Amino acid sequence: LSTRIVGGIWWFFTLIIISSYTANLAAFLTVERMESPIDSADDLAKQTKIEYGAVEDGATMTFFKKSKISTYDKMWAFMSSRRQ
Amino acid sequence: LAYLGVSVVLFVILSTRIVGGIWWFFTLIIISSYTANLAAFLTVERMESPIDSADDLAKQTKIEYGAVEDGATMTFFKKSKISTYDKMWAFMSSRRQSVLVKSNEEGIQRVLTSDYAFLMESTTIEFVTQRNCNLTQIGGLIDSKG
Amino acid sequence: SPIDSADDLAKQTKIEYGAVEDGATMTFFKKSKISTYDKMWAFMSSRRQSVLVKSNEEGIQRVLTSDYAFLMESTTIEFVTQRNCNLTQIGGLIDSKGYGVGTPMGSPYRDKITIAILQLQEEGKLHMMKEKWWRGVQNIGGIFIVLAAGLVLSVFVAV
Amino acid sequence: NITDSLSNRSLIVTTILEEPYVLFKKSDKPLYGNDRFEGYCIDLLRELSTILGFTYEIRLVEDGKYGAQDDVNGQWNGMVRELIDHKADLAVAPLAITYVREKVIDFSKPFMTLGISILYRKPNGTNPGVFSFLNPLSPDIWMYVL
Numbered sequence: 307l308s309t310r311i312v313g314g315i316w317w318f319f320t321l322i323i324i325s326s327y328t329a330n331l332a333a334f335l336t337v338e339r340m341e342s343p344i345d346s347a348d349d350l351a352k353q354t355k356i357e358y359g360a361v362e363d364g365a366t367m368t369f370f371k372k373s374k375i376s377t378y379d380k381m382w383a384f385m386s387s388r389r390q
Numbered sequence: 391l392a393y394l395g396v397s398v399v400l401f402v403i404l405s406t407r408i409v410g411g412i413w414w415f416f417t418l419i420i421i422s423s424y425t426a427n428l429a430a431f432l433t434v435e436r437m438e439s440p441i442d443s444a445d446d447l448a449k450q451t452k453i454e455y456g457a458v459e460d461g462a463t464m465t466f467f468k469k470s471k472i473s474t475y476d477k478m479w480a481f482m483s484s485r486r487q488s489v490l491v492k493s494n495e496e497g498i499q500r501v502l503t504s505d506y507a508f509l510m511e512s513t514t515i516e517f518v519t520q521r522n523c524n525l526t527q528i529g530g531l532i533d534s535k536g
Numbered sequence: 537s538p539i540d541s542a543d544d545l546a547k548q549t550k551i552e553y554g555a556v557e558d559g560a561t562m563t564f565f566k567k568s569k570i571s572t573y574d575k576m577w578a579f580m581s582s583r584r585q586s587v588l589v590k591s592n593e594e595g596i597q598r599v600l601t602s603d604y605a606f607l608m609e610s611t612t613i614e615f616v617t618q619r620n621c622n623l624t625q626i627g628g629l630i631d632s633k634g635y636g637v638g639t640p641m642g643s644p645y646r647d648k649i650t651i652a653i654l655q656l657q658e659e660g661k662l663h664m665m666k667e668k669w670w671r672g673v674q675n676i677g678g679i680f681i682v683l684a685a686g687l688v689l690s691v692f693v694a695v
Numbered sequence: 696n697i698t699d700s701l702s703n704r705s706l707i708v709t710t711i712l713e714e715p716y717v718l719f720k721k722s723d724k725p726l727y728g729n730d731r732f733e734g735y736c737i738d739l740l741r742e743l744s745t746i747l748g749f750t751y752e753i754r755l756v757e758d759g760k761y762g763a764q765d766d767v768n769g770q771w772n773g774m775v776r777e778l779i780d781h782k783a784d785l786a787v788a789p790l791a792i793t794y795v796r797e798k799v800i801d802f803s804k805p806f807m808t809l810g811i812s813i814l815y816r817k818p819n820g821t822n823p824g825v826f827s828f829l830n831p832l833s834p835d836i837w838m839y840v841l
């Protein structure tokens with residue numbers, strides 16, 4: 307009689323452990339899939355984790371400063387907030 | 391209640407195969423629904439982005455922020471070299487009578503009371519983090535002076 | 537997430553909104569440079585003639601009919617929460633505004649707004665006159681239904 | 696000065712169809728004049744009658760709006776046009792402070808202080824019943840499983 311209860315709570319424990327592992331793996335895979343491969347700088351606008359910028363002041367500085375497209379203006383805002 | 395139903399099954403006991411299939415299927419639907427709820431809760435937890443830079447503070451109006459009035463910080467912010475600092479000064483002017491303080495320790499206790507982001511000097515950040523462990527800094531140096 | 541301010545409306549652009557026409561703080565939101573309210577003025581100026589209401593009640597009935605968001609003053613919202621229990625207020629008093637009466641130069645009530653109506657405020661007359669105008673599961677159950685029907689079938693097979 | 700002529704003068708009240716507690720009183724007799732409306736502005740006009748005692752013409756308007764200027768016109772229409780085209784040269788109107796009403800209205804202390812908030816309906820948010828049978832997946836795969 308006690309062996310049925312032992313098997314029931316063991317199945318319950320293994321099911322909870324497997325479900326928690328599956329949920330953690332699903333959350334990690336969803337974060338990794340949300341972190342898309344970077345192309346055409348609209349991923350650069352979203353992903354602030356990978357820092358970037360131009361080389362220094364000059365043609366690349368003034369082109370992004372004068373840009374009114376608001377993607378490259380957001381680029382200039384990000385690279386001018388941390389320009390040092 | 392499901393265990394009460396299982397006890398009813400144990401009281402009343404082809405039919406065994408279908409009641410085992412029904413119980414196993416009901417168990418896996420309950421387990422899968424719990425697993426999807428846990429996966430959604432873990433996904434929305436890991437998708438949280440805590441505010442780190444002033445760019446994070448600019449797009450959010452829920453967390454109030456500010457500095458000590460006439461302490462040369464909003465003098466820098468009203469120059470508005472970057473549009474993020476223009477939004478900072480615009481929120482400071484729109485909430486002039488709301489989130490402005492007169493002392494550094496007055497701005498400290500508003501952070502300790504409610505959700506507040508105090509803009510103040512980075513060397514005194516080292517003092518208030520060496521003293522109190524409940525407070526910290528976010529981001530680096532917005533503007534360098536001496 | 538459920539809506540807590542206009543920042544949530546900036547995040548959730550699925551549910552649209554509207555405001556009173558002409559100069560009901562659209563030009564104020566045109567002049568405002570808060571980034572969330574920059575997005576708010578940008579979307580409601582893209583929807584300037586598309587999704588907008590003219591009167592106060594026209595936007596109110598839009599929330600009464602459909603899931604409409606309605607940005608207005610606290611006085612009208614505070615009046616209609618007493619009128620209908622189905623309506624809620626989202627956020628707080630963000631934009632400070634003064635509803636007041638203009639005065640002539642040298643009129644006797646010009647300073648008595650600041651004295652005698654201030655004496656009404658000190659005696660509190662201005663707020664209870666406002667008060668006297670306006671007072672101010674599921675899926676698991678379905679799973680249990682299906683499981684109970686299967687249990688009835690299993691009992692009726694089992695005997 | 697016209698101070699010797701402005702005394703004992705009739706005062707013109709030009710308001711619009713206000714808040715829904717400020718309307719015509721419900722009676723069989725059309726009580727007009729100073730009894731045309733009952734509301735908080737009417738209570739403030741009773742207070743001004745205790746302050747001034749001048750005769751007040753509480754009457755409706757032909758436009759019914761606190762209009763502003765246009766880009767193609769340049770003239771502030773509505774009640775601002777009423778207060779500049781000599782219907783009442785003294786700017787007396789209950790409205791909110793705008794960017795342009797600081798200079799086109801002589802103005803006084805605002806009696807009412809208010810904010811801008813969001814009005815939304817309260818949702819039920821309840822969908823009870825057997826909806827594992829009513830998933831967003833098609834029931835073609837469900838009868839395939841059957």
Ligand SMILES: C/C(=C/C=C/[C@@H](C)C(=O)O)[C@H]1CN[C@H](C(=O)O)[C@H]1CC(=O)O
Nearest residue numbers: 556557558559560561609760761762791
């Ligand atoms: C009651 C009201 C109605 C709408 C007026 C608009 C359509 C107008 O007069 O151009 C006014 C009161 N003062 C507000 C303002 O000046 O912004 C305006 C809108 C409101 O009720 O908030």
